[PDB]
A paper describes a structure:
NoV VP1 has two principle domains, the shell (S) and the protruding (P) domains, linked by a short, flexible hinge. The S domain builds the interior shell that forms the basic structure of the icosahedral [name], while the P domain dimerizes constituting the arch-like protrusions extending from the shell.
Peptide chain ranging from K230 to L526 can be modeled, while distal parts of two loop regions in the P1 subdomain (see below) comprising Q260/N261 and G502/G503, respectively, could not be modeled due to un-interpretable local electron density maps. As expected, the P protein is dimerized via a non-crystallographic 2-fold axis, forming an arch-like P dimer in dimension of 54 Å × 62 Å × 67 Å. The P dimer is stabilized by the vast monomer buried surface area of 3,733 Å2 (including two monomers) comprised of both hydrophobic and hydrophilic residue interactions contributed from both P1 and P2 subdomains. BV P domain retains the basic structures of the GI NoV P domains. The P2 subdomain is constituted mainly by a β-barrel structure formed by two twisted antiparallel β sheets: β5-β4-β8 and β8-β2-β3-β7-β6.
Residue numbers in the entry:
A (entry chain A): 230 to 259, 262 to 501, 504 to 526
B (entry chain B): 230 to 500, 504 to 526
The structure:
């Protein structure tokens, strides 16, 4: 089966780290990416905490508890089935923002708890300290005096906004310490390094309320991930050459190389100019690693 | 291109009316019920309808600038990317919730980067999907004043549907089509109603458990990833219906036959689909007659 990428304009696809439309792409000015969401091989093998649907991105599910003076969530997969530590660093879709304050909105999700009343709440979750242990199945919730009614209840949580940990800057490249002090989490997607030849890793961006740095970078659009999982196309070269084309004339606006590990590069800054955000990526061919952009 | 449907298990795909994994299939209690959802609407050859978007990231969201007119609060709507809603193509901005005659409980955040340097950008608000003040087709919806909106007046926000309650005096009817508003001679832009096939067939609805309180099961007529699949493929529609098998992902046994029609929905002949495992994979078998017997 021939390899391909989605025919969809970039600005109609979602970020893979937050559920937001992509509003740009850029190379970094500096920081090694080791995102756990948006990770997949070109032949469709999911990595880290990455799953298929954008509906899963940056969400959690589980049962709220109160134990030894502290509140928390016992995690499950987003469909309510159990999280098995062997399969991944955390349940699929779990936010991959580390060393920061995750401001979550949540709702009760048991149908029997959704007959009457207001099922909703909000809570802060630190992606740091030993009590942040999603690989072990648990995370601490900061007590906001409004959690008691939810103790024992199953909820789904979504990432509403993010702030820095007090005393620290907000680092969107930090890897969460999923396994606490017990172990390095199983099946972490690896860090990515650029290959040479002037190439730089491309990040797809979304404006999002990561307060103090409201531009979330990811290494693949979510719909690329589902595309590769769907296709399972064998990888047949060092790199997949893509052209980013005008959506109407199909004229090439810029070349990119996608590597088997599931990320792409460019040689930036080829006369000042700005690429539009409504272009379409098109697979041209497998090329050697020596292909010069 | 040859036609196909996603090679993804059903329970890994999203509902098209809320961003939630599909956890079931059902037929309607009244098999003559006419759905006219505005999200999850697309033809088999990839033409979007209603407020349907490509990405699940857009489902049941809104964007716009909050206003206060003499104590009447509201949002002047835009598309989710911040560009203007021109109403050329859709009855509301793309992704807009299609739950009608009910109380939408939204969570929102300021979305201008200059408003995202420090502080808490978040809030919540109730929006009624009823009354003339709910006029998203005309670019405006009323916000219920919760005494916490003033700091956001003049600010651009993105809103998402957190949960839904019934309108006082009414049941929470998930088949209701919102009254999006009319604008003189301009077309409604509504995705059309789907009339039940009859003769033993029944429309298949993909369901998700969701906090539509008092009715916590949201039905839709296509998984969201079917929509992006068809938009991507643009496969010419070569028959009046597409025969699908729903197959066990392991054993690869056919668990049931379905028909997909060009308008972008699926039917079955209940014996019903609700009893099927939810981890199966739909597979395109062949183009068949619209009269093909399941």
């Amino acid at each position: 089966k021939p390899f391909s990428v989605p025919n969809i304009p970039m600005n109609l696809m979602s970020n893979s780290r937050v559920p937001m439309l992509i509003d740009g792409m850029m190379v970094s000015n500096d920081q090694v990416p080791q995102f756990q969401n948006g990770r997949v091989t070109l032949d469709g093998q999911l990595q880290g905490t990455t799953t298929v649907s954008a509906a899963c991105i940056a969400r959690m599910r589980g049962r709220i508890f109160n134990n030894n003076g502290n509140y928390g969530v016992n995690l499950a997969e987003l469909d309510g089935n159990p999280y098995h530590a062997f399969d991944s660093p955390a349940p699929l879709g779990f936010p991959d923002f580390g060393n920061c304050d995750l401001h979550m909105t949540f709702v009760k999700i048991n149908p029997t708890e959704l007959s009457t009343g207001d099922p909703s709440g909000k809570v802060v979750i630190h992606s740091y300290d030993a009590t942040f242990a999603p690989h072990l199945g648990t995370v601490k919730l900061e007590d906001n005096n409004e959690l008691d009614q939810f103790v024992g209840k199953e909820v789904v949580l979504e990432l509403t906004w993010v702030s820095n940990r007090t005393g620290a800057t907000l680092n969107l490249w930090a890897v969460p310490n999923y396994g606490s002090n017990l172990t390095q989490a199983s099946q972490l997607a690896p860090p990515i390094y650029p290959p040479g030849f002037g190439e730089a890793i491309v990040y797809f961006t979304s404006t999002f309320p990561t307060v103090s740095n409201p531009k979330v970078p990811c290494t693949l659009p979510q719909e690329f991930v589902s595309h590769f999982v769907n296709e399972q196309a064998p990888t047949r070269g060092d790199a997949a050459l893509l052209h980013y084309v005008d959506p109407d004339t199909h004229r090439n606006l810029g070349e990119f190389k996608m590597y088997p590990e599931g990320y792409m590069t460019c040689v930036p800054n080829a006369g000042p100019q700005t690429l539009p955000i409504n272009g379409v990526f098109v697979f041209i061919s497998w090329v050697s690693r020596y292909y010069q952009l």
